[PDB]
Amino acid sequence: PDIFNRDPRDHYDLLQRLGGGTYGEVFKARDKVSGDLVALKMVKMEPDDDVSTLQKEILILKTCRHANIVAYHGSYLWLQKLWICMEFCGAGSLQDIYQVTGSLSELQISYVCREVLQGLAYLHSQKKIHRDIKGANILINDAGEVRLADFGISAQIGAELARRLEFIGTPYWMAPEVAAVALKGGYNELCDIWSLGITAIELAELQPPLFDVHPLRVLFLMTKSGYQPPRLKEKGKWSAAFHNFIKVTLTKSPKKRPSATKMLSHQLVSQPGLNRGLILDLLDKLKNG
Ligand SMILES: Cc1c(-c2cc3cc(NC(=O)O[C@@H]4CCC[C@H]4C#N)ncc3c(N)c2F)cnc2c1NCCO2
Ligand code: NA
C-alpha cells in the first residue's frame, strides 16, 4: 500500500497542533509542492508493533470509498513514528462548531445521526469498533459532509491499551478472564450506538448528561444497579421521534440495543428534508452568525 519510508517533513510544513491533546498528536500541515492543507496524525510506533501487520490495516484504510469515513491521503513511517495523512477540516469537529453556533436544530441533529450511523455500519461490517463516538470525534469537512475517522490499526489500538495497563495495573497475577475483560474493556460494537445517543443529547444541549458532576462520582452513578438511561432535558422542544431515538439508542442491555443498520430505519433518520444543506447552513452560521 506504499507506506513511504520518508520523513513527512520532506513534503509538509506543520502549522498548528489540533485538539489540545484529546486527538493525541495531530497537526494541520501544508503540502510544500502543492499549496494544499492536510491533517497529519502521528502515531508513535513501538518496536513490538509489526510493520507488516500495519501494511494490512493501511490497505483497508486506502481502499475505503465510504462517504462517512474521513479520507486517507497516504502515510509516512520515519524513525519509529507512523504518520497518517488525511483531509483537513476548517470547521473541525461538531464540538468546535456548537461552541460557536449553539445547539443544533433537531433536523441538523437528525442528519448528523443518519450520517454517523452509516459510518458506524461500515466500521462494524469490518468488525471494527469506534469506541469514542462524541461531538469531538465527528468532523464536518468543507463540503458539509459528516465523517468518522477510522483508526482501526494495531499501533493505535496498542497505544490506547498502554494507557489501560497503567489503569488496571500489573498483570502477572491476573486470571485469564480478568485479563480478557480488561483488554476488551467492555467495548462492543453496540457501545457506539449508546455513545451516539449521548452525542445527540450533546448536540442538543451543548453537553452530555451528568457533565456538571465529577467523573469519579459519575462512574459510580453509572454503575449503580438502578442507573437509568438519560433523556433530553426540555420535553417541549423536541419531537417524539427524537425522544424515541434516544430511548432506543440508550438501551442498558447490549443484548436489546439496536445495531447501526436497524437504527438507519428509525423515524428520525428516515425523515424527509435531511440534506447537506442543513450542514451548510450550520457552517455559514459558524463562520458568520
Ligand atoms: C477527530 C480525531 C482526529 C482528527 C482531527 C481533525 C481535525 C481537523 N480540523 C480541526 O481540528 O480544525 C481546527 C478546530 C477549529 C479550528 C481549526 C483550526 N485551526 N481536521 C481534520 C482532522 C482529522 N482528519 C482527524 F483524523 C485525529 N485523531 C483522533 C481523533 N479523535 C480521537 C482519536 O484520535
Ligand atoms: Na476536505
Grid cell listed for 263: 437504527
CATH of 94-153+182-287 among 1.10.760.10, 3.40.630.30, 3.40.50.170, 1.10.510.10 = 1.10.510.10
Give the 3-state secondary structure of residue 217. helix
Give the fold, CATH level 3, of 8-86.
Phosphorylase Kinase; domain 1 (3.30.200)
Experimental technique of record:
X-ray
- In the reported structure, the alpha carbon of residue 88 is separated from the centroid of ligand 2 by a whole-number distance in angstroms of 6
Whether 250 lines ligand 1, by a CB cut-off of 6 Å, is no
The CA–CA distances, whole Å, from 82 to 3, 139, 163, 197 equal 9, 22, 19, 33
Grid cell listed for 203: 448536540
Give 20's contacts (C-beta < 8 A, 6+ positions apart).
none
Whether 88 lines ligand 1, by a CB cut-off of 6 Å, is yes
Report the C-alpha gap between 17 and 38 in whole angstroms.
Answer: 12
Give the 3-state secondary structure of residue 158. helix
Q: Is 18 annotated as a binding residue?
A: yes
Asked if 37 contacts 88 with a C-beta cutoff of 8 angstroms, the reply is yes
> Edge-to-edge strand order for the sheet containing 81-86?
12-17, 26-31, 37-44, 81-86, 72-77
Cα–Cα–Cα angle for 277, 282, 288, rounded to 5 degrees: 120
Task: Please tell me which residue in 132, 142, 150, 284 is annotated as part of the active site.
Answer: 132
Q: Where are the domains of the chain?
A: 8-86, 94-153+182-287
